Amino acid sequence: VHIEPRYRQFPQLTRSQLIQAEFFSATMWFWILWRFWHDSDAVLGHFPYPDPSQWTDEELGILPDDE
Amino acid sequence: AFSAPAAYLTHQQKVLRLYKRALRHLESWCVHRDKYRYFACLMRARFDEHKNEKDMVKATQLLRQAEEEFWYGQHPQPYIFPESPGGTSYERYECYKVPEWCLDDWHPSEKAMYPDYFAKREQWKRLRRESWEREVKQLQEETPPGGPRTEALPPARKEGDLPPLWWHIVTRPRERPM
Amino acid sequence: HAFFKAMLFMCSGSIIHSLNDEQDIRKMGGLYKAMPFTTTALIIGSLALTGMPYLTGFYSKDLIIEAVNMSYTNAWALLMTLIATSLTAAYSTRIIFFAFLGKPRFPPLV
Amino acid sequence: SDAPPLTLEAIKDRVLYVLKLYDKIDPEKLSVNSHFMKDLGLDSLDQVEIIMAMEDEFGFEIPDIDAEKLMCPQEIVDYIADKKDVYE
Amino acid sequence: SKMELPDYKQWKIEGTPLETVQEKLAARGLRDPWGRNEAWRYSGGFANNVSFVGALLKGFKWGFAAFVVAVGAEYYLESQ
Amino acid sequence: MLKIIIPTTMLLPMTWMSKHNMIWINATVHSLLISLISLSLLNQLGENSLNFSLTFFSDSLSAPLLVLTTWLLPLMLMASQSHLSKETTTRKKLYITMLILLQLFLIMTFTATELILFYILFEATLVPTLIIITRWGNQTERLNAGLYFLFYTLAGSLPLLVALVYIQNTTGSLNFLIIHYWSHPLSNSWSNIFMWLACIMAFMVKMPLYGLHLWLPKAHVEAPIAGSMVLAAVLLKLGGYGMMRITTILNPLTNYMAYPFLMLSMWGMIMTSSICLRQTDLKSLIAYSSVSHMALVIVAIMIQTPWSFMGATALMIAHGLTSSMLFCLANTNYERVHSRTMILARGLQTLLPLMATWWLVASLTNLALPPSINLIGELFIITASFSWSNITIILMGMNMMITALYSLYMLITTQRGKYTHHINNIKPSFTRENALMALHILPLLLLTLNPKMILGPLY
Amino acid sequence: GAHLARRYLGDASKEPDPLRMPTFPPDYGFPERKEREMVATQQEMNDAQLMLQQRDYCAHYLIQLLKCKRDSFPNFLACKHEQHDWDYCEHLDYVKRMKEFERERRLLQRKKRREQREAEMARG
Amino acid sequence: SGYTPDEKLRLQQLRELRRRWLKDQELSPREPVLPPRHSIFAVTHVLIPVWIIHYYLKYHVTAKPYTVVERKPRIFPGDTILETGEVIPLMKEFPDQH
Amino acid sequence: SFPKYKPSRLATLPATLDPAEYDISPETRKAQAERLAIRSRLKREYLLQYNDPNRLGVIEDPALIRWTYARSANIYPNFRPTPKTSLLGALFGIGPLFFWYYVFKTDRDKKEKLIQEGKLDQTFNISY
Ligand SMILES: CCCCCCCC/C=C\CCCCCCCC(=O)O[C@H](COC(=O)CCCCCCC/C=C/CCCCCCCC)COP(=O)(O)OCCN
Ligand SMILES: CCCCCCCCCCCC(=O)SCCNC(=O)CCNC(=O)[C@H](O)C(C)(C)COP(=O)(O)O
């Protein structure tokens, strides 16, 4: 592959480098989409985070402010 | 680096040096080309607005104020050409530079390769050996009794003379020796 | 980190060699189209360095950040870690913007 | 490989190319031996701008002490050739 | 090998940011005598370039197409 | 051990009966053969020493020193013959005779069973060195240097002699075996304090101790190349060997007494390392580096632990080899350019690549790169000092930094940069100089391959 | 998080101390409490060489997961169920720790308020 | 401004001399007068070193105690030992939190 | 108009910011001419030997010889015992020694006192 200078013009390009660049960007994006589709919980979490305010006093074993 | 410096700089020389420094640092601040062109034209207009000042005292005061402004507003990280005294490849190829006299120390086996090059080298050495005394005589005659005021050297003036003190300027190693 | 850091330095060296040993980003113009493979390699490396999900940098940096957030730790250290992981994306943006986008700023002998 | 073996003709062509793109100098009347101050009628600031344009074109910087003495394109190309070791 | 420089008269500031810079200079009585030395940075194959988001989503089209066709194959492969 | 002593006394008439153009060859060959013979002394025991007779014995501490001396003699012979080419035959034979006498005195010194015979030989080593310095030195200060080399020594060693004879009037023997077996504690009295000082200060001035070191830069800079090699390689180690021998009778007075010498040694290693950073002469830098290393050895001997003694032995051998190599390296450039200024000749890596490789290896070994025996000795001494007191790691640590700096500084000043333009007589390196460097450097790494041979009797 | 703001800006006494917890008896508010049981024996955990920190109450699921990973070695995508069970056990343990924190918080609040109210009643 | 005639003339003379010197640096076509299988790499660089290393470890290093020490293999409930043949019981009847 | 720059020892004053170079006198011009004449004479003297075809060796520089001699051998002849010299010598050559002696003696006294009471945790301390 012989590529010569241009002097104020866009350089010459061979089809192989565009093909490889586009292919690699494409497989990166495909991998990201496929992994997100199959392992979404790795980003959004898996188990629900509980809110302690909705826990009953009886469950926590606290006397009704009398004893 | 090639020219002999003078005893001092004149007012116009300092003005031009400040102009060049200001333009370069403004380009460092204005990365993109159109913005740089706009602000460089503005700087040129600001610069030649006081171009016709006949009072030298006010001229020097303006120069001093301009230099103070430059020092305040300079770029801490200006663009440097890669081979300039501050560039990232300034003295990169100095280790590859070898002086020519080293070729005298080569083994005759090493000199057996490249016979024509060493024949040409012998021709050059003969030329220098023949020209040395004429160079010394010319330097003696041209120079004043007190001594030489500047570092400038005279050229050859006679029929077959060479410029005095030429050997180490002509036989520079190279810019990209290897 | 080894993978994408080595690759980022390699792409930087490729750019330096192409532009006659020039290293200042202020004299690098539009290399997105002029240098396709280098462009995609640097983009992938930058996205991995910033911890884009499911890339190589994610599987360690994300876990590190969420382990720092959920530990009994110094508060100033946590805040500085967060500010640093923001500045990481900042300087990756700086590199991409100044080196690959825009119009050429290198000498005319391409 | 690396950059081609730059020659004197290329240096002259590029210097003239930069010069005809200066809006203040007309292309037709410009010649290789034209003095910047006498024939084209430029002052010192224009010479400084020309030197910076040359530096940008060839990718290296000329010190001011040397830059002041260059007054016609032939001197510019001679300085460039001497700096970069160009003999052909 | 053996190519000459392009004709110098094709470099114009027409349709470039240099045009707007020149217009703004004319509004102040100044002029820009170096635009034709920069016109080559906008004239040819450097005329247009992508944005930051456009650069990040370089190979998104082909990757999304592959992901969609793979998922479609997976959905009607469990029908065995 | 007459099987090593007699061949040197035979080296004498062989030199004086040789043809005018064969002295160097014969001397070098037979010195190398004597070194090979002396290699047999390394087979040492684990409990006692090799007691050859009533007069001579070999310990695990003295055998590596003997091997180092016998190995150094051919190196000095090789180094000297370049600058003595124009000398007449008789004066060349006299120079070789001085070197042979010095080696004989050192060999007999390192194996004497009695302390008084050790004193006599350790003082007889003065005469050939002084003659060499004051006769075959190059500049005019050499005479002054000789005086500084002489009286500085004698002022320290004359009291020791007195102490020595006094001891023999009290215990009845100066034999090192009887002295070791019949050892008695020293009380805390003024008489015992001054006995301690008399026994110690001679060896202190020989190392030399900081503040008593002013003779060393003069003597090592003004001497010829062989004189410098023997001064830095072996003659400094006499003080350490003598101190390690004599400390067996000074307990327990040593703990109280050592403090000023320990502080002097530590602050002086710091000061001499700092001095090496601003030195315009190349030989003076190497001299002050020697002072720093010997200060470390002084600390090691003074704290008096087994690990410290192993470190002292290893460091002494390593420093001898390294300093001899560095002095030879400097002398090559000096012979080229006839000046000792360090910034005069620059960028020598461009002109002499293999010589630059030798410079790099010598500078690497000077800064104690692992796993060289330099680093082994230094680390053992540092560990012993840390056990002595945890704060010492400060001062030692600082030394480990400064040393490296000046070492690399030397290299960067001589080999890198751009060559001096007007120096146009840098001839290519000879086979003799390269062989000298290789014969200096290879035994160091070979010793690293088997370190127990230079770790002393405490191993 | 809000607890940090409530403690640093909020009254210190009301908020629980992470280093000193619990400060009330385990059976204070409860009439009776079951003792939490452990499935994996000490010998099994020692043989599995789990870790000094992984030997919690969820160690049995971890042992199952490690065995499943070792058995299905080339298929490193086969141990999804066991991983999920171990994660679920860890989640339950963390939820129980949150329960304990909230218990200490509201016990401290109720106790201090009740003591202050009783003091106010007895002070009049 | 500019060169003086003396500087100009000296520049031309030195420049012509320098071009001549640089021209003389070329090499004529004969200047370097020199005076007078497929998978072999995997054998001399992999197989021989591994032979030497394996022999040295098997017959010299192992011949001394505690030279090559391996941590014990992991043992799980339900496993069978090769040497003794003993089996390990199951694990205490999981509560089955399905 | 703009914030000012103050020079220091390790960050000196630029030439363009120097007020001495903006208020010049014919005496200053004569001095500059003399300096240039001296420099040019020295440069010619050097270049005459540098380009000599018959010169083999090094060109001896009297300035370098003077520098080395002044930095090495001219110091003691020009030394006078003054209050400043005596104070600086005493401080820099005495203070560190006693400082380190006090530090090390205190450390070792503490360690010995701790050892005497039998509470130092010297278990496994085999090598010393
Ligand atoms: C270049 C520097 C070298 C100079 C250093 C030289 C100084 C060496 C240290 C002084 C050595 C003098 C001691 C001589 C040998 C003593 C042996 C001995 O044990 O004798 C003692 C006696 O000790 C003495 O008599 C010593 C007195 C000192 C006299 C000479 C003074 C020399 C200078 C002293 C101060 C110097 C301090 C060291 C030098 C510091 C560095 C400048 C016991 O004798 P008895 O009388 O039987 O006692 C028991 C019954 N009553
Ligand atoms: C980017 C941050 C730094 C930039 C800030 C810089 C600020 C400085 C801007 C203001 C500078 C001035 O105007 S300072 C104005 C100085 N005034 C004079 O010099 C009057 C006398 N004029 C002459 O001598 C000649 O005409 C001469 C002009 C030399 C041309 O010479 P030629 O015609 O023969 O080439």
Side-chain angles (χ1 to χ4, degrees), chain B residues 103-104 106-123 174 178, chain H residues 24-35:
Chain B
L103 295 172
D104 303 350
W106 274 25
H107 201 244
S109 314
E110 311 187 80
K111 286 181 187 163
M113 323 173 23
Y114 328 99
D116 314 286
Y117 180 85
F118 278 91
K120 284 199 215 74
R121 184 160 199 273
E122 203 62 56
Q123 225 81 42
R174 218 170 294 145
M178 270 163 198
Chain H
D24 281 352
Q25 297 311 297
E26 263 134 40
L27 289 189
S28 80
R30 82 188 171 103
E31 292 293 320
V33 198
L34 266 39

Side-chain angles (χ1 to χ4, degrees), chain G residues 1-10 12-13 15-114 119 122 124:
Chain G
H3 54 280
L4 297 178
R6 258 203 330 275
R7 169 145 170 247
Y8 298 131
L9 314 161
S13 303
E15 226 68 27
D17 199 9
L19 308 179
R20 250 83 74 211
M21 179 153 15
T23 74
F24 299 90
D27 56 74
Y28 173 79
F30 291 59
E32 78 291 337
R33 277 177 86 169
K34 302 84 38 174
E35 190 214 74
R36 160 141 75 142
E37 75 156 281
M38 175 88 201
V39 187
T41 312
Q42 280 185 309
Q43 186 54 12
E44 298 161 346
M45 272 180 288
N46 209 284
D47 290 345
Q49 306 183 312
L50 294 181
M51 223 87 75
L52 281 208
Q53 30 198 264
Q54 313 189 292
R55 284 169 207 207
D56 51 34
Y57 285 96
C58 328
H60 48 284
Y61 287 124
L62 176 54
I63 295 177
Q64 222 186 51
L65 169 61
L66 288 171
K67 193 204 232 232
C68 179
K69 295 239 57 183
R70 185 202 65 187
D71 295 7
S72 300
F73 154 57
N75 190 11
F76 60 90
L77 306 168
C79 321
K80 288 342 271 173
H81 195 218
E82 282 86 5
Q83 255 271 23
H84 185 289
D85 295 86
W86 184 43
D87 286 344
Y88 187 76
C89 213
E90 230 62 38
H91 159 73
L92 295 179
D93 188 320
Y94 201 79
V95 158
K96 239 150 46 173
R97 289 175 57 191
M98 305 174 69
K99 264 165 191 342
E100 211 98 344
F101 184 90
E102 193 38 8
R103 153 113 182 261
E104 168 97 352
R105 192 265 272 280
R106 51 185 49 182
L107 270 192
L108 217 31
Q109 225 153 76
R110 159 261 192 194
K111 185 263 290 179
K112 158 156 201 152
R113 155 183 85 252
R114 200 198 39 67

Side-chain angles (χ1 to χ4, degrees), chain C residues 1 81 105:
Chain C
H1 171 262
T81 304
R105 293 187 295 281

Side-chain angles (χ1 to χ4, degrees), chain F residues 52 111 123 163 177 219 226 239 274 280 303 316 333 372 388 436:
Chain F
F52 299 119
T111 46
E123 225 73 21
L177 293 174
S274 281
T280 69
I303 59 184
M316 275 204 288
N333 293 350
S372 57
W388 188 80
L436 184 58

Side-chain angles (χ1 to χ4, degrees), chain F residues 274-286:
Chain F
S274 281
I275 289 182
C276 278
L277 285 161
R278 309 272 315 267
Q279 281 289 314
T280 69
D281 201 280
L282 186 49
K283 257 180 136 209
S284 300
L285 202 153
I286 307 160

